[PDB]
Amino acid sequence: MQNLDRDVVIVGAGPSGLTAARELKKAGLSVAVLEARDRVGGRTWTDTIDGAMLEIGGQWVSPDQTVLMELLDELGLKMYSRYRDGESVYIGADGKRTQYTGDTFPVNETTKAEMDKLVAILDELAAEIGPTEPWAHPKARELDTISFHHWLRQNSNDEEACNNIGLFIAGGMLTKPAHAFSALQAVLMAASAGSFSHLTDEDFILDKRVIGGMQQVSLLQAAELGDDVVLNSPVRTIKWDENGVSVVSERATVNARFVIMAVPPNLYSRVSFDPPLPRRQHQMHQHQSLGLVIKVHAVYDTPFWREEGLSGTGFSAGALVQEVYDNTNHGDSRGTLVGFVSDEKADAVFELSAEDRKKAILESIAGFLGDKALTPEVYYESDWGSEEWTRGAYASSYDLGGLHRYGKDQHANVGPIYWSSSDLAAEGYQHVDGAVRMGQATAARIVEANKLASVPVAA
Numbered sequence: 242m243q244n245l246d247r248d249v250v251i252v253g254a255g256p257s258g259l260t261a262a263r264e265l266k267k268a269g270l271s272v273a274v275l276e277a278r279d280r281v282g283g284r285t286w287t288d289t290i291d292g293a294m295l296e297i298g299g300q301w302v303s304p305d306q307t308v309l310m311e312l313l314d315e316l317g318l319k320m321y322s323r324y325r326d327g328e329s330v331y332i333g334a335d336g337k338r339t340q341y342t343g344d345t346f347p348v349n350e351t352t353k354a355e356m357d358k359l360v361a362i363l364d365e366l367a368a369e370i371g372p373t374e375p376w377a378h379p380k381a382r383e384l385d386t387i388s389f390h391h392w393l394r395q396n397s398n399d400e401e402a403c404n405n406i407g408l409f410i411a412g413g414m415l416t417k418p419a420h421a422f423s424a425l426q427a428v429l430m431a432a433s434a435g436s437f438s439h440l441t442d443e444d445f446i447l448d449k450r451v452i453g454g455m456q457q458v459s460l461l462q463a464a465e466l467g468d469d470v471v472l473n474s475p476v477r478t479i480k481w482d483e484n485g486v487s488v489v490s491e492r493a494t495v496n497a498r499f500v501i502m503a504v505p506p507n508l509y510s511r512v513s514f515d516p517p518l519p520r521r522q523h524q525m526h527q528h529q530s531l532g533l534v535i536k537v538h539a540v541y542d543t544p545f546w547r548e549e550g551l552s553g554t555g556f557s558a559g560a561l562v563q564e565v566y567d568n569t570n571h572g573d574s575r576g577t578l579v580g581f582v583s584d585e586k587a588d589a590v591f592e593l594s595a596e597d598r599k600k601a602i603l604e605s606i607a608g609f610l611g612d613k614a615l616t617p618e619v620y621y622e623s624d625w626g627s628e629e630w631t632r633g634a635y636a637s638s639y640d641l642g643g644l645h646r647y648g649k650d651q652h653a654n655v656g657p658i659y660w661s662s663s664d665l666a667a668e669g670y671q672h673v674d675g676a677v678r679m680g681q682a683t684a685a686r687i688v689e690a691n692k693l694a695s696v697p698v699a700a
């Protein structure tokens with residue numbers, strides 16, 4: 242049982258907590274990072290499964306994510322682009338598989354125009370409302386008390402268009418059904434990425450990856466922090482008063498002046514607070530939940546789809562696997578596909594045995610890229626739902642109505658206790674870039690709090 246004294250304790254060694262920790266040390270404050278798992282990285286994790294390197298969690302970098310990109314440059318990390326040559330596959334409402342190129346689905350002209358209409362409206366809302374305080378906008382209550390499902394249908398009678406547009410947010414981002422989150426929540430997602438248009442473009446949101454894996458972002462920061470990072474040490478209790486904390490984890494107890502809960506909001510209540518958090522937090526914390534998505538990994542002897550002039554990209558609002566992409570590692574001679582099974586469809590397939598689920602998922606992928614898909618050398622499902630220190634994927638969002646109700650307090654410190662994760666971010670919301678931005682912003686706030694306590698207040 243280590244017994245440490247530090248300026249700041251950070252709960253969780255994901256990218257948010259680790260970024261905050263480095264920024265704190267840089268500002269002259271000592272830190273300790275207490276991590277539950279036997280590794281750093283949190284929702285980012287590179288592992289080798291039966292001889293195949295896979296990114297089990299977060300991996301994509303988009304062009305809006307300049308903060309993450311600066312960090313990559315500082316860490317000496319390099320990026321590469323997802324393969325996108327050739328034709329993509331779309332399976333529409335008419336059940337027809339059609340290959341295509343360009344920035345437009347091969348849909349009828351009415352559906353194409355309805356999609357453009359919806360996207361333009363959403364782009365305008367995102368620009369008006371912004372990703373920082375969506376809850377504060379005059380349109381917040383209107384937009385946050387109707388589901389995205391119903392909002393779409395108030396604005397278009399075209400079911401195929403509505404389902405496609407829903408796909409980019411529901412299955413694509415929040416990993417919850419469109420009837421379970423609000424239009425305002427969709428607008429926040431869009432604003433956080435620079436526009437709704439950006440979310441519709443896989444060449445934007447799924448543009449690049451980090452050579453060697455996204456987990457390096459955490460691994461390298463942790464290596465630099467040395468044994469200020471304690472692994473296999475879940476935080477159980479935070480005793481606090483107005484002036485500091487004693488944080489009790491399984492392998493270390495740390496006395497400090499501040500603590501950062503650098504964990505997804507659904508896991509806040511895993512920590513006992515003495516005294517309890519205020520009623521506001523007690524309530525707010527219950528109204529948040531992670532989505533659910535199965536990240537499917539299939540490795541083949543070669544990227545077979547390229548032989549047929551396909552990019553490996555596939556979309557279908559109606560399929561079991563709604564999205565598939567080329568996810569071949571930089572320099573690999575084998576080929577890797579990644580597919581996504583979201584929310585209620587994930588529930589459904591989790592009903593099946595592992596064997597039957599694999600079969601159904603591969604058959605769905607074959608629907609896009611052909612029967613070679615049926616027989617990978619390695620098949621693996623990211624299973625973040627089973628992880629007690631995550632419990633879902635990709636990220637947390639409020640229940641319907643919760644964003645405009647609680648958003649204004651999501652960043653509020655409780656005395657010495659701060660909250661920091663990608664789930665709370667504006668730009669980069671729910672993504673590693675957001676995690677990094679939040680780590681930086683929270684460290685800055687603590688630095689400023691420290692400065693106010695140490696510099697005599699002006700007359």
Ligand SMILES: Cc1cc2c(cc1C)N(C[C@H](O)[C@H](O)[C@H](O)COP(=O)(O)OP(=O)(O)OC[C@H]1O[C@@H](n3cnc4c(N)ncnc43)[C@H](O)[C@@H]1O)c1[nH]c(=O)[nH]c(=O)c1N2
Nearest residue numbers: 253255256257277283284299300301476662663671672673
């Ligand atoms: C499968 C799927 C795929 C993707 C992604 C995730 C998931 C799993 N995402 C999202 C993404 O990775 C995520 O936003 C960040 O990893 C979050 O960083 P945080 O540090 O904020 O939380 P994160 O969950 O990563 O870290 C929190 C940490 O605290 C720990 N912890 C929790 N409670 C604790 C306790 N009581 N005591 C001690 N430790 C505790 C955990 O074990 C963990 O390491 C993504 N993002 C992106 O930019 N591009 C992408 O392509 C993807 N794709």
